[PDB]
Amino acid sequence: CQDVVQDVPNVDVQMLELYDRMSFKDIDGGVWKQGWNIKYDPLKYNAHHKLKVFVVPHSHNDPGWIQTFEEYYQHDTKHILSNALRHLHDNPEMKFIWAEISYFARFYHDLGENKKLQMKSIVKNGQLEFVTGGWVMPDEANSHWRNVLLQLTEGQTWLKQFMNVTPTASWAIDPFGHSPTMPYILQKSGFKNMLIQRTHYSVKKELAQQRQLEFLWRQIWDNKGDTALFTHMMPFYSYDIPHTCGPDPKVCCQFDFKRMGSFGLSCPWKVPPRTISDQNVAARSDLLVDQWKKKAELYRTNVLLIPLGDNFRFKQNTEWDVQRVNYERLFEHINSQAHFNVQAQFGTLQEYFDAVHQAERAGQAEFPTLSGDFFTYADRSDNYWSGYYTSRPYHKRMDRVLMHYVRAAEMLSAWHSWDGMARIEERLEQARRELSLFQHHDGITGTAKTHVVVDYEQRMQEALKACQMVMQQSVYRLLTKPSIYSPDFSFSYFTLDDSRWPGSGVEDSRTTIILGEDILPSKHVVMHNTLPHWREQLVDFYVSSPFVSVTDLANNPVEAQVSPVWSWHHDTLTKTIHPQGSTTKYRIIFKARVPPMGLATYVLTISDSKPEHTSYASNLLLRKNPTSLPLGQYPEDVKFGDPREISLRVGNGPTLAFSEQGLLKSIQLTQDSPHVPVHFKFLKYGVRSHGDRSGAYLFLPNGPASPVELGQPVVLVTKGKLESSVSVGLPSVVHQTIMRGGAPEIRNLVDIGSLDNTEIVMRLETHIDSGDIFYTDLNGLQFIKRRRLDKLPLQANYYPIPSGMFIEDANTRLTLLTGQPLGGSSLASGELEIMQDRRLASDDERGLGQGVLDNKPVLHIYRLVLEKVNNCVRPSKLHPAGYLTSAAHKASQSLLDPLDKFIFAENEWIGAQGQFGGDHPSAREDLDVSVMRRLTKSSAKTQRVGYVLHRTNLMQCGTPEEHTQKLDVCHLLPNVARCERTTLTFLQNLEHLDGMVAPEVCPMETAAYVSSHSS
Ligand SMILES: *[C@@H]1O[C@@H](CO)[C@@H](O)[C@H](O)[C@H]1NC(C)=O
Ligand SMILES: OC[C@H]1O[C@H](O)[C@@H](O)[C@@H](O)[C@@H]1O
Ligand SMILES: [Zn+2]
């Protein structure tokens, strides 16, 4: 294994380093507004050294944006693909590249058999070429790496089966900034080349000047370079035709032949395209070749890429003809005029890359190495695209919930082969596709139109239901005596119980377990643990009585705590936000202990009076002017008091102090230790009253945030043996700090209401001496060092927080982990902040044509980890990466992959078993089984099960490692006949494994394995 901590990679371009040196001045560069007047030596190309030009036709198709997926498919995309089929069929020299497999599968599935055969033939012969081949072209900021892999696999699996092809070149022209998570996954999935477009205009200018637009992109911790993927960054402002032939869009627009009038398009530079004829071809070629040669100066080989397309292009018949015919006239003249020393043709992306590497292999060019990311994107001036890190946060949170449900459903059902009647494969495919779709750069980003957002939500809700069905059928099968097991595959044996989605105050969706001495004395519940190690976690259920005790299936008592069910109401009468307690239901909380990748059964039993092993939380309502809060049968009376500072300690854990406003003030790690100042504060950003307005994409604050005026909020304190909390009703936020004896859990019920042109931020203020340094993660995969740059505006210092962020000094670290992607920063030494929601009245001129006014209540969840780090082995000052501690990593897992909870849905579960997976290896804490998926249907003689194994890297801080078992995924299922290492998509075998044993992977590495079994 490479050491990912101690060796700083030597790269030609390191993006943090580059950022620190670059000036970012937005000067008018001339016709190339953000560059300079490119000059070239006309003698550079000659008879023995021509410029080879590849014109690559394309059509950018959004799986939802202004219209829904189905709306665009009917109105645009089906016609684009129908016309691509006809035109490439009829014109053997024409070429086309296709990215979005969601649309292609939809199209192909509907084709008659004759047309399917024509399609396969134009793919086989190289005319139509798939680039990337993911279900979508995903967002790279907010997306979890697990979902990037999911959508990639979904599209490429379809492509393999039906098209007999696996793309090795990637095309990402529209995501708003770019992540190194992409080459990480792609290089581990057989890719050899990738292309990106949306990077900061200053970065384009800088890399162009050094001819560093093509580079070997390696991971920030990769000293050796085996992660490297050849990357082509496009140089200009857009992927559109005007910004792809060369530096001058006034000229380039004249070679978009769709802009002459009849298609209702034109050139904003006031010079139209003209039909090419024998009388203008020479002057037209003069102009075009001059653009090409200027573009070529920015790169190192004699092979030039010329994208030809735009959004939903190549729709009409006549469009194909007008582009093709005019370009071919230009090619015939240009190629036959020796003095140009050019050979131009239509090409695909792979053709371009193949030729580039041929040039490379002939000693013609050597490429620079690079590490780092390409956030935060600005396309012009101070217009930084940090708004979409937060936009539509409800759906961002939903993404993470569905992420886990898909994993849990695939894992739980993978243990068995299923009859076709069970419709397991069907339900899983549906869920994978809907989650995959949401990865689109207008999905999770929250940059789609309101009705499109609703469509994504509906699609995700159906996916959730599908996952629930598969999960509960799987639990019933895994925990029932086989000779008793009697499935009705449409029946609900268990209902899922999710405490945090949609969340208390968002939706009353949770069922109460209804017990009574005259109705039902007891209820079986089951916990699932998708993680490959033994796990304890507190779990809660609603019950119709506070007199309930908990046992395991050996009938051993389990210590439990009962608390009231509190809901917060903005009372329009009193104008306060205050809690009401249920008089008919209660929360029972207990510690579940569940095997690695396994299940554990418990029983909740009613009694007449207080059970021996159940305790009751005290409650304290802090408020001037209190009124009574009756709690039905709850055995302990609510106390009242004037607002005051409070202090709480659960277990042996930290002691937390709170202000009289109910907000964290300090954390004391142990009995003796200092009360370390850690203050939560809620603030608000506004919008500019003139100049550019914030929208779904852009964050353009009118200065630093101002404190939310809190008034005298109502604070509710609940104190229990197992769990305590402080909740406070703030304007727009019910803020909750929960304690269970380790790092606190934070929950925000965020309802921005009708507060227009407001962004709500949650800030942490400490005295940690972090200076201008902070760390944020990329796609839940890695943590990257950020440096606050005061030479950049506030919105430029905002970064994606897809899963976590931290600050540290020599001695102390504060880490905030999230259960949802949001935007955030550290705008001053000792601070962390993260945006909660934003409501914007105006459009920000990127095509959406609307503000963001469709906010809905969302339960944000976090863990807050204060640690001493003076004993930790950290990377040197010059290393671009950071690493979590064991505790911070476990905290992230608790948010993203909690125990799943199942309530048995009938009165009696006949043949119930107590446990599943007690013999599963409990693997080292840094290792995860990210994916377990059965890859064959029941009729396959040889069964195959695919596993994705990921190892993170945790800091060595002097905690001795616990004894753990080697995890060999190929022996998790019986009767193994083969173990293969594969690409991460499972589509290519890379290594036949001796002894049928799957090795564990190295820190920061990800491997895939497929075990084969005799049926
Ligand atoms: C898939 O493509 C090829 C491998 O590159 C052929 O070897 C193989 O026959 C093909 N499968 C077909 C054409 O059905
Ligand atoms: O301007 C932002 C915008 O870029 C492109 O035009 C699109 O195709 C969209 O997906 C995206 O939202
Ligand atoms: Zn797009």
Ligand nearest to the CA of 240: 2
Q: How far is CA 214 from CA 37, 197, 205, 237, in A?
A: 21, 12, 13, 17
Q: Are residues 569 and 627 in the same domain?
A: no
User: Kind and range of the H or E element at 295?
Assistant: helix 281-296
Cβ–ligand 2 contact at 847 (below 6 Å) = yes
Q: Which two three-digit tokens encode residue 567?
A: 């809901």
Which ligand 2 atom minimizes the distance to the CA of 848? 12
Q: Which amino acid is at 284?
A: R
Going from the Cα of 846 to the center of ligand 2, the distance in angstroms, rounded, reads: 7
The reply to whether ligand 2 has any atom less than 6 angstroms from the CB of 174 is yes
Which ligand places an atom closest to the C-alpha of 164?
Answer: 1
Residue with tokens 């579960």, as numbered in its chain: 909
Catalytic residue among 76, 174, 497, 751: 174
Which of 333, 353, 381 corresponds to the end of one domain? 381
Q: Are strands 560-571 and 557-558 parallel, antiparallel or unpaired?
A: unpaired
Copy the structure tokens of residue 463: 């996916």
Out of 173, 442, 445, give the residue to mutate to test ligand 2, the one with the largest number of ligand atoms within 8 Å of its CB.
Answer: 442
Does ligand 2 have an atom closer than 6 angstroms to the CB of 310? no
Asked whether the beta carbons of 327 and 55 are under 8 A apart, the reply is yes
Q: Whose CA is nearest to atom 1 of ligand 2?
A: 846
CB of 455 shorter than 6 A to ligand 2 = no
Q: How far, CA to CA in Å, does 175 sit from each of 306, 321, 483, 764?
A: 20, 30, 53, 30
From residue 816, alpha-carbon distances to 65, 364, 820, 884 in Å are 32, 48, 12, 11
Residues 333 and 407 in one domain: no
Helix or strand (DSSP H, E) at 154: helix 145-163
Co-location of 651 and 745 in the same domain: yes
**For ligand 2, is residue 313 a contact (CB within 6 Å)?**
no
Pure H helices in 783-929: 886-896
Of residues 186, 8, 23, 919, the one with CA closest to residue 532 = 919
DSSP 8-state class, residue 511? P
Nearest to 561 by CA among 610, 505, 615: 615
Angle between helices 424-438 and 101-110 (to 10 degrees): 130
- The helix/strand/coil state of 191 is coil
3-state class (DSSP) for residue 111: coil
Asked whether residue 574 falls in the same domain as residue 658, the answer is no
Residues 882 and 981 both lie in one domain: no
> What separation in Å is there between the alpha carbon of 168 and the centre of ligand 1?
16
Is cis: bond before 231, omega within 30 of 0?
A: no
Q: Which of 251, 263, 258, 288 is nearest to 275 (CA)?
A: 258
- Residue 846, ligand 2, Cβ within 6 A: yes
**Burial grade of 703 (CB within 10 A; 0-12, 13-18, 19 or more):** exposed
> Of the ligands numbered here, which is closest to the C-alpha atom of 66?
2
Instruction: Identify the burial level of 695 via C-beta atoms within 10 angstroms of its C-beta, where 0-12 means exposed, 13-18 middle and 19 or more buried.
Output: buried
484 and 574 housed in the same domain: no
Round to whole Å and give the CA distance between 259 and 261.
6
CA distance 356 to 116: 33
Separation of CA 637 and ligand 2 centre (Å) = 57
For residue 880, whether the previous peptide bond is cis, meaning omega lies within 30 degrees of 0, is no
404 is in an annotated binding site: no
CA of residue 237 to ligand 3 center, whole Å: 15
Catalytic, 174? Answer yes
Amino acid at 854: D
Nearest ligand 2 atom, CA 65: 10
| Ligand 2 site, residue 610, Cβ cutoff 6 A | no
Task: Report how far ligand 1's centroid is from the alpha carbon of 358 (Å).
Answer: 25
Positive or negative torsion for Cα 685, 690, 694, 698: negative
In ligand 2, the atom with minimum distance to the C-alpha of 440 is 10
Q: What is the C-alpha separation between 575 and 435, in angstroms, rounded?
A: 40
Exposure of 218 in the CB half-sphere (CA atoms within 13 A): 23
Is residue 608 a known part of a binding site? no
**Hey, whose CA ends up nearest to atom 2 of ligand 2?**
846
Check which CATH number belongs to the domain holding 978 and give it. Answer: 2.60.40.1360
Q: Which helix (H) or strand (E) holds 724?
A: strand 724-730
Measured distance CA(141)–CA(150) in Å, rounded: 16
SS3 string of 344-386?
Answer: EEECCHHHHHHHHHHHHHCCCCCCCEEECCECCCEEECCEECC
Closest residue by Cα to residue 373 from 89, 778, 773, 693: 778
Same domain, residue pair 911 and 890: no
Taken in order 707, 712, 714, 719, is the CA torsion positive or negative? positive
Q: How far apart are CA 490 and CA 448, in angstroms?
A: 35
In whole angstroms, what is the distance from residue 356 CA to residue 53 CA? 11
Please give the distance, rounded to the nearest whole angstrom, from the Cα atom of residue 853 to the centre of ligand 2.
19
Please report the atom of ligand 2 found closest to the CA of residue 448: 12
Q: Quote the ligand 3 centre to 62 CA distance (angstroms).
A: 5
Residue 339 tokens read as 């003095």
Q: Please indicate, yes or no, whether residues 235 and 182 belong to a single structural domain of this protein.
A: yes
Q: Is 62 marked within a binding site?
A: yes
Tell me how far the alpha carbon of residue 164 lies from the centroid of ligand 1, in angstroms.
6
Q: Whose CA is nearest to atom 4 of ligand 2?
A: 174
Rounded Cα distance, 492 and 486, in Å: 13
CB 248 within 8 A of CB 32: yes
Ligand nearest to the CA of 163: 1
Does the beta carbon of 238 lie inside 6 Å of ligand 2?
A: no
Sign of torsion, CA 283 285 290 291?
positive
Query: 311 CB under 6 A from ligand 2?
Result: yes
Which of 103, 846, 850 for mutating ligand 2's site (highest number of atoms within 8 Å of CB)? Answer: 846
The CB density around residue 853, as the number of other CB atoms within 10 Å, is 12
Q: Is the CB of 60 under 6 A from ligand 2?
A: yes
Which residue range is the domain that position 735 belongs to?
A: 618-897
Please work out, in degrees rounded to the nearest 5, the angle formed at the alpha carbon of residue 506 by the alpha carbons of 500 and 510.
Answer: 55
User: Please, are residues 523 and 603 in contact by the beta-carbon 8 Å criterion?
Assistant: yes
- Indicate if 354 and 236 belong to the same structural domain: yes
Contact 287, 281 (CB under 8 A): no
How many Å apart are CA 861 and CA 836, to the nearest integer?
Answer: 11
Top mutation candidate among 62, 237, 313, 438 for ligand 2, by most atoms within 8 Å of CB = 62
The distance of Cα 66 from the centroid of its chain, to the nearest Å, equals 22
Which residue minimizes the CA distance to atom 7 of ligand 2?
A: 174
Angle at 893 between CA 543 and CA 227, to 5 degrees: 155
Residues 6+ apart with CB under 8 A from 547: 606, 607, 608, 609, 610, 611, 614, 633
Secondary structure, 3-state, 725-762: EEEEEECCEEEEEEECCCCCEEEEEECCCCCCCEEEEE
Residue nearest to atom 12 of ligand 2 (CA): 442
- Structural domain ending residue among the three candidates 897, 929, 947: 897
The H or E element spanning position 336 is helix 317-336
DSSP 76: I
Q: Is there a contact between 383 and 375 (Cβ–Cβ < 8 Å)?
A: no
Q: Please name the amino acid found at residue 802.
A: P
Do 638 and 736 lie in one domain? The reply is yes
60 marked as binding residue? yes
What are the φ and ψ backbone dihedral angles of 1009, each rounded to 5 degrees? -135, 145
**What is the secondary structure of 984-1014 as a DSSP string?**
TTS-SEEEEPGGG-PPPPPTT-EEEEEEEEE
Check: CB of residue 774 under 8 Å from CB of residue 805: yes
Give the SS3 label for residue 92. coil
Verify that 331 and 429 share a domain, yes or no.
no
| Nearest bound ligand to the CA of residue 120 | 1
Nearest-atom number in ligand 2 for the CA of 847 is 1
Please choose from 392, 441, 444, 456 the residue to mutate so as to test ligand 2's pocket, defined by most ligand atoms within 8 A of CB.
441
Burial class, 975, CB count within 10 angstroms (exposed 0-12 / middle 13-18 / buried 19+):
exposed
And the tokens for 118?
Answer: 């024509």
| Method by which this entry was solved | X-ray
Distance 563 CA to ligand 3 centre (A): 48
Distance 165 CA to ligand 1 centre (A): 8
Ligand 2, atom 5: nearest CA belongs to which residue?
A: 174
Q: What is the DSSP string of 429-465?
A: HHHHHHHHHHTBTTTTTS-S-HHHHHHHHHHHHHHHH
Q: Are 973 and 908 in contact (CB under 8 A)?
A: no
Q: Tokens 């296709």, residue?
A: 98
Q: At CA 979, angle to CA 978 and CA 980, rounded to 5?
A: 120
> In this structure, are 1 and 119 located in the same domain?
yes
Is 442 touching ligand 2 by the criterion CB < 6 Å? Answer: yes
Q: Is 441 in the pocket of ligand 2 (CB under 6 A)?
A: yes
Contact 989, 938 (CB under 8 A): no
**Domain C-terminal end among 345, 365, 381:** 381
Domain count, the chain: 5
The domain that holds 749 is classified in CATH as 2.70.98.30
> What are residue 217's DSSP bridge partners?
229, 370
Tokens standing for residue 693:
């307005």
Among 666, 625, 624, residue whose Cα is nearest residue 645? 666
Question: How far is 577 from 584, CA to CA, in rounded Å?
Answer: 22
